[PDB]
Design a protein around this ligand. Structure first.
Ligand code: B12
Ligand code: SF4
Ligand code: SF4
Length: 370
């Protein structure tokens, strides 16, 4: 007894910015739309595939009785700007500044569980953060962490949407928290700011057209999204920056600004090894360097950076990574606005190895009236 007050006490003790409680009752109100996302092809592929495991918490535990939702806030503005150099910089979502949230939160949930082991008997748990089967977002709503916006995210009054979420499924009998009075209203800002219009209106999405996805999808980024990621080479925050509830927050926790706003051409020099050493700790490193270097080439093209030309030419001639080659060929068509005869001969004189490079090459050629 007074576990709920005791938990809350040790929560804030170990850096958890908010905590909530809810039943292990299933979530079949979601079924309908989860299944419709998959059938309509609006799913990314990152989602847990088994829909049953997604809505029935007992499939993850059995002895499930309550679920404890945690939230850890993160800064969205940079404490200290990075220092101007020769090299232009891209941006990379604050969701991925500093240590990979997955590790941070799993550590916090471990501590919370160890601190509960002491104050009861027969305690049973199952921790999740992002990579688990539950809908992290809907759990935090039932637990009154915040409400789900039209942008799909969980929004708190206190810390905005700039929170990482987690869950500790458990066999404890505990008083559910309330939920929240505040919502969206007739706000619509996010819906109108999304540069792809992926958001459907009801907190639901064609994720396939989210730029956050596009920056993480493997392969060749479709033409439409290249221009639109501007210089943001990982994630998208547009639907949160445009949100009233984020209007005036700064939040607590360590950030290297050079990892948060990386210099692009030096970034393109990284190997698997140097990439691991320097970037391996952030969330955005979970698929390796290649998707990021592709994106960086795109950023350089979006900046029309004449200083990248020689590097792009090196990527193309070496051709050890075809996605990069094809992206670079495109990038030259963007950067070199008035090509000299020498450049027309360079371009005319490539004969792309593979189909994606061939495709991008044909387009530049056509654009340059070759
Ligand atoms: C797959 C995934 C993605 C994909 C797909 C995004 C998406 N919206 O589905 C991509 C790569 C695009 C993505 C992007 C981002 N994501 Co992500 N993503 C996930 C992941 C692993 C699973 C997503 C999932 O379960 N799909 C849910 C889809 C299928 O459901 P749906 O049909 O849209 O359902 C919506 C409705 O049911 C609605 N719903 C619930 N309550 C209510 C109430 C009412 C009345 C109504 C009508 C509807 C409604 O909410 C659901 C979505 O939130 C989750 C973690 C997790 N396991 O939950 C993180 C998660 C959702 N992502 C997270 C983050 C931070 C992001 C980004 C902000 C990262 C960035 N800065 O770029 C973006 C923003 C995109 C966005 N607008 O949601 C955080 C959200 C943070 C928060 N505080 O809410 C989560 C919770 C991870 C975490 N542990 O923090 N993500
Ligand atoms: S992250 Fe960007 S692209 Fe994705 S929904 Fe939000 S605004 Fe739209
Ligand atoms: S922008 Fe407005 S509509 Fe969108 S989530 Fe924020 S509050 Fe809701």
């Amino acid at each position: 007894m007074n576990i709920k007050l005791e938990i809350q006490k040790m929560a804030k003790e170990i850096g958890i910015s908010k905590i909530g409680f809810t039943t292990a009752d299933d979530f079949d109100y979601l079924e309908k739309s989860l299944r419709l996302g998959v059938e309509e092809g609006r799913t990314t592929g990152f989602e847990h595939k088994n829909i049953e495991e997604r809505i029935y918490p007992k499939l993850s535990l059995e002895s499930a009785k309550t679920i404890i939702s945690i939230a850890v806030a993160y800064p969205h503005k940079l404490p200290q700007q990075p220092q101007k150099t020769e090299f232009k910089r891209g941006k990379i979502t604050p969701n991925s500044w500093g240590l990979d949230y997955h590790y941070v939160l799993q550590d916090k949930l471990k501590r919370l569980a160890k601190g509960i082991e002491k104050l009861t008997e027969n305690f049973e748990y199952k921790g999740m953060v992002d990579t688990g089967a539950l809908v992290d977002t809907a759990v935090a709503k039932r637990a009154g962490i915040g409400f789900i916006g039209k942008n799909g995210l969980v929004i708190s009054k206190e810390y905005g949407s700039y929170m990482y979420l987690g869950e500790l499924i458990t066999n404890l009998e505990i008083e559910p928290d309330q939920e929240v009075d505040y919502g969206c209203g007739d706000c619509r800002r996010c819906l109108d700011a999304c540069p792809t219009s992926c958001l459907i209106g009801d907190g639901t999405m064609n994720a396939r057209r989210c730029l956050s996805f596009q920056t993480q999808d493997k392969g060749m980024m479709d033409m439409e999204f290249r221009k639109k990621i501007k210089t943001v080479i990982y994630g998208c925050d547009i639907c949160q920056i445009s949100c009233p509830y984020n209007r005036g927050i700064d939040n607590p926790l360590d950030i290297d600004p050079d990892l948060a706003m990386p210099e692009l051409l030096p970034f393109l020099e990284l190997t698997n090894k140097s990439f691991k050493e320097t970037f391996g700790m952030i969330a955005g490193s979970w698929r390796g360097k290649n998707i990021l270097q592709r994106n960086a080439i795109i950023a350089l093209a979006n900046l029309h950076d004449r200083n990248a030309i020689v590097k792009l030419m090196e990527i193309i001639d070496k051709n050890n990574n075809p996605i990069h080659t094809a992206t670079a060929i495109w990038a030259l068509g963007e950067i070199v606005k008035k090509p000299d005869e020498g450049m027309l001969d360079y371009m005319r004189g490539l004969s792309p190895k593979d189909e994606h490079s061939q495709a991008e090459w044909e387009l530049v050629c056509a654009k340059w009236q070759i």
